[PDB]
């Protein structure tokens with residue numbers, strides 16, 4: 001049994017809710033929250049900007065030190081950093097950004113990072129301002145992630161379309 005409430009069960013291991021990921025993290029304090037990161041860990045907008053704002057920019061400060069030491073992530077890659085006030089840990093995962101012309105086949109590699117964690121609170125990777133089709137992102141998630149994933153989806157309209165169209 002875990003602390004996640006109000007989720008619709010899609011599969012053995014994937015659950016979904018219409019919820020603002022920031023508010024959900026603040027309430028649950030999960031072991032792992034996933035960030036929709038870019039390779040530079042520049043948390044300007046989208047999920048990343050919202051998570052970082054909720055940490056009062058401490059996520060960005062920590063991320064700048066990580067990049068100064070290690071250099072950029074790979075598209076499809078990840079790193080584990082602090083979860084600050086939102087979670088124990090933040091798994092920063094880089095899905096391909098379609099609006100930058102990145103290979104959508106890298107979305108599966110991105111989701112494979114989730115398998116290193118038993119339970120996660122996450123957004124749909126490569127969706128929103130990353131330009132991918134969120135329906136596709138949910139399909140790759142279900143077909144790739146084997147650990148227990150709680151997907152929070154901000155937009156009620158998109159949430160309803162993801163549930164209604166789920167095979």
Ligand SMILES: Cc1onc(-c2ccccc2)c1C(=O)O
Pocket residue numbers: 020021045046047048050123124127128129134152153154155
């Ligand atoms: C899809 C999608 O596109 N934009 C967002 C989003 C969610 C929270 C904060 C900012 C953007 C989002 C999501 O993960 O539900």
